[PDB]
Design a protein around this ligand. Structure first.
Ligand SMILES: Nc1ncnc2c1ncn2[C@@H]1O[C@H](CSCC[C@H](N)C(=O)O)[C@@H](O)[C@H]1O
Ligand SMILES: [Zn+2]
Ligand SMILES: [Zn+2]
Lengths: 117, 281
């Protein structure tokens, strides 16, 4: 449903965020990994790096563009998440995709801004 | 103890039986937003951590039946968590999905052309549709083992009571060691993973395939298995050991006692050192 909806617009990020901000059901079936909560805690990592305050997800499954089979917006054609693991704050696990669309990792520090840098 | 292990492996006690094939009668699982196949794959990986897998750089792994009806591939993400960072994962399914594989190929596994030999094959393929040996994707998998698998390479291929193949059981005789592994996470299912560890390309054990499926079912019917995921409580050593296994090119004429011994201990692969080309036809 929400996956079909982001196909009807030129701003899929805004479409998804407006949709969940208006009460729509967040995308489900994100691939939540089981992990030792002993990682560094950076946003995006080759291996799971969740701290005790985070959960780790398979990157493709929390990428709106991957899930909806639409063009990735990066300058190249490369998902930042796909093939990697994405750490999500534990308080935000109800909508991992929305959290990734609403946040950006530190350019120097690689942690989430407002959760690292 | 057994419920802290990742699962159960068929013992030679049942491998050497001679019985008719009977119906599988099992008497007998919750997850913490975590898909069940997370636990099933992690326990398969945990068991493979105790086997002598070859683990080279640029390790070549192909994962068949990786997709789910949800359009995701939890097993592939588990393989990404488990394998070396420089491992190459190719995955495949009849149905569309998205995954953390390096290369993802849609359609029948028979459309997957492996140009070079691989080091590890994982198959979770299963067709939704008198229990006789099945053909289906097993014909493709058996040919893959005979042609597209490195000496020293390994396979883990899902079977069930009714999804199984005489030919695949017999091919296990061409590995240094083999078993059927049943995860504790899916212990109330007739599912098991036929494991061939360290491919030798030569018959080490003569196996009657139809008799051995009867032995596998006899084992399942004889062996209490409790659903459990206790083995996933401590994941501190989950990742596959970075063995740095060497890859060598040798002619058949050169494969001597020393080489067979190294292949059998997980200490060597024999295959091309090229760059991998795996594409749809
Ligand atoms: N011939 C074939 N070629 C490729 N995939 C096949 C196949 N026959 C069956 N399958 C796939 O076998 C899969 C079994 S379910 C796979 C679940 C998945 N491994 C996970 O990680 O959750 C189905 O998705 C089915 O489409
Ligand atoms: Zn993506
Ligand atoms: Zn920072």
């Amino acid at each position: 449903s929400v996956l079909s909806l982001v196909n009807f617009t030129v701003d899929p990020q805004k479409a998804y965020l407006d949709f969940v901000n208006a009460g729509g059901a967040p995308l489900t079936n994100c691939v939540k990994m089981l992990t030792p909560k002993t990682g560094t805690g950076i946003a995006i990592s080759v291996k799971p790096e969740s701290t005790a305050d985070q959960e780790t997800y398979g990157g493709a499954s929390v990428c709106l563009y991957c899930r909806a089979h639409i063009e990735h917006p990066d300058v190249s054609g490369v998902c930042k998440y796909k093939g990697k693991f994405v750490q999500i704050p534990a308080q935000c696990v109800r909508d991992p995709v929305g959290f990734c669309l609403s946040n950006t990792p530190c350019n120097v520090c690689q942690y989430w801004i407002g959760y690292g840098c | 103890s057994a419920d802290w292990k990742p699962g159960h492996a068929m013992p030679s006690l049942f491998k050497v039986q001679n019985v008719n094939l009977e119906r599988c009668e099992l008497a007998n699982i919750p997850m913490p937003g975590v898909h069940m196949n997370i636990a099933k794959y992690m326990q398969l990986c945990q068991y493979l951590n105790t086997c002598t897998l070859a683990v080279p750089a640029n390790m070549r792994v192909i994962h068949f039946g990786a997709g789910s009806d949800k359009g995701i591939a939890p097993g592939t993400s588990v393989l990404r968590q488990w394998l070396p960072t420089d491992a190459i994962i190719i995955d495949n399914d009849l149905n569309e999905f998205v995954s953390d594989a390096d290369i993802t190929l849609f359609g029948d596994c028979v459309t997957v052309r492996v140009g070079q030999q691989v080091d590890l094959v994982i198959s979770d393929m299963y067709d939704p549709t008198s229990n006789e040996s099945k053909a289906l994707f097993f014909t493709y998998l058996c040919n893959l083992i005979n042609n597209n698998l490195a000496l020293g390479g390994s396979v883990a291929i899902k079977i069930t009571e009714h999804s199984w193949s005489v030919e695949l059981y017999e091919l296990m005789g061409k590995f240094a060691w083999w078993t059927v592994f049943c995860t504790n996470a899916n212990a109330s299912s007739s599912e098991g993973f036929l494991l061939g560890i360290n491919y030798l390309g030569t018959i080490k054990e003569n196996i009657d395939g139809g008799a051995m499926h009867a032995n596998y079912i006899f084992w399942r019917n004889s062996t209490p298995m409790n659903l459990s995921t206790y083995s996933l409580f401590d994941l501190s050593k989950f990742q596959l050991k970075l063995k740095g296994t060497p890859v060598l090119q040798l002619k058949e004429s050169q494969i001597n006692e020393l080489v067979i011994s190294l292949l059998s201990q997980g200490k060597l692969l024999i295959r091309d050192n090229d760059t991998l080309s795996v594409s749809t036809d």
